[PDB]
């Protein structure tokens, strides 16, 4: 499953 570049923002987990 190759990973293409993206204009989507990178996701981060919640900060409590």
């Amino acid at each position, epitope marked *: 499953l190759p990973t293409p570049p993206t*204009r989507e923002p*990178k996701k981060v987990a919640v900060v409590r």
Partner: antibody
């Protein structure tokens, strides 16, 4: 105050290589995708490449395959762009751009101030 | 490469007036995934570009509602209602759907006198 800070101007001879840096302060680059962009007055803006600093995934514009090498060091919160075999057509301002910090739908987008490269003997 | 062309090249405007800038791609920039990654930037002299609009019509944080993006397929528009002094500079469109991602050549929004 929160920003991407790029390294200072470089003057370099043709055939040499240079490594430009872009350092985050106020955020963690593991939470961002990083992009590099080239700008010249007459040819305009050009996209160089994309990197996910956390896991090292990379993609380059065809025209920069072999010219550009992107890396990142999450421990120092820094991304790098190496340019090899330099010529006058590499004389430009280089910008880094981080996009990320997305918990649900909101996100952050930061640009470095640009680094000027002059290729000349 | 997918070519992004902007018109007009230069747009003189009086403060308070409306401005509209067009961006055309040489072929469709709808991504496989259904999204259209058409973005608009403003760059002021000496500064980096700043994101105004992403995915055709979505205003980035802090961008006032006088900026609006529209379009579909190969034809897009940025409209600025009530131009303010802080809006002056060069506007670029950008497609991030097909690699290599490409920028338009820019449209200079300039003040009349």
């Amino acid at each position: 105050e929160v920003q991407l800070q790029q390294s200072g101007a470089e003057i370099v001879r043709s055939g040499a290589s240079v490594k430009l840096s872009c350092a985050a302060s106020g955020f963690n680059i593991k939470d961002y995708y990083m992009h590099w962009v080239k700008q010249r007055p007459e040819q305009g803006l050009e996209w160089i490449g994309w990197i996910d600093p956390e896991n090292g995934d990379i993609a380059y514009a065809p025209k920069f395959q072999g010219k550009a090498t992107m890396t990142a060091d999450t421990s120092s919160n820094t991304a790098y762009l190496q340019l090899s075999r330099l010529t006058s057509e590499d004389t430009a301002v280089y910008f880094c751009n981080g996009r990320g910090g997305m918990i649900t739908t909101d996100f952050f987008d930061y640009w470095g101030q640009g680094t000027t490269l002059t290729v000349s003997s | 490469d997918v070519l992004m062309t902007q018109t007009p090249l230069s747009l003189p405007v009086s403060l308070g007036d409306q401005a509209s800038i067009s961006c055309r791609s040489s072929q469709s920039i709808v991504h496989s995934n259904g999204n259209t990654y058409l973005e608009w930037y403003l760059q002021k002299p000496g500064q980096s570009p700043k994101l105004l609009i992403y995915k055709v019509s979505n205003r980035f944080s802090g961008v006032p509602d006088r900026f609006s993006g529209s379009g579909s397929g190969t034809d897009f528009t940025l409209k600025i209602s009530r131009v303010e002094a802080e809006d002056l500079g060069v506007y670029y469109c950008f497609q991030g759907s097909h690699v290599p991602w490409t920028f338009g050549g820019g449209t200079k929004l300039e003040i009349k006198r």
